Curated annotation (Swiss-Prot):
EC code(s) of this entry: 3.2.1.17
Family: Belongs to the glycosyl hydrolase 22 family.
Localization terms from the record: Secreted
Known catalytic reactions: Hydrolysis of (1->4)-beta-linkages between N-acetylmuramic acid and N-acetyl-D-glucosamine residues in a peptidoglycan and between N-acetyl-D-glucosamine residues in chitodextrins
Name of the protein: Lysozyme C
Gene Ontology cellular component list: cytoplasm; endoplasmic reticulum; extracellular space
Domain (C-type lysozyme) ranges: 1-129
Domain of life the protein comes from: Eukaryota
Tissues of expression: In the egg white and polymorphonuclear leukocytes.
């Protein structure tokens, strides 16, 4: 499924992500936007086997097993594919362990380059939250 700006905002909140590790909800909506485009199915291969899956584009060399990325430790202990379903529990759930290992949302190339230090609040303006 491909989420609505507003809509995904809400969803992620229901699920504990607002100020999770002190990261505003906007950080999260902005990140997923430029990262996956509100599309939970999206997938992406980088050059080293590794692939990126779902709304928050979590990698497979560390977070989820996908059966074809050898370097794999399955720290999220979920099969990559689970991350693509129209239900972001797994992702959000897994996303929480990436945000807390140590590099905040810096672990996400995108938020950093295009979200980090912009007024992320405008992402959730107009939202009934």
């Amino acid at each position: 499924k491909v989420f609505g700006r507003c809509e995904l905002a809400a969803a992620m909140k229901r699920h504990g992500l607002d100020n999770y590790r002190g990261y505003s909800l906007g950080n999260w909506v902005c990140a997923a936007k430029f990262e996956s485009n509100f599309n939970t199915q999206a997938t992406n291969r980088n050059t080293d086997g590794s692939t990126d899956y779902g709304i928050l584009q979590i990698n497979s060399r560390w977070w989820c097993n996908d059966g074809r990325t050898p370097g794999s430790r399955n720290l999220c202990n979920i099969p990559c594919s689970a991350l693509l379903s129209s239900d972001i529990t797994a992702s959000v759930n897994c996303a929480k362990k990436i945000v807390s290992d140590g590099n905040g949302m810096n672990a996400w190339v995108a938020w950093r380059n295009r979200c980090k230090g912009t007024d992320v609040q405008a992402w959730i303006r107009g939202c009934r939250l």
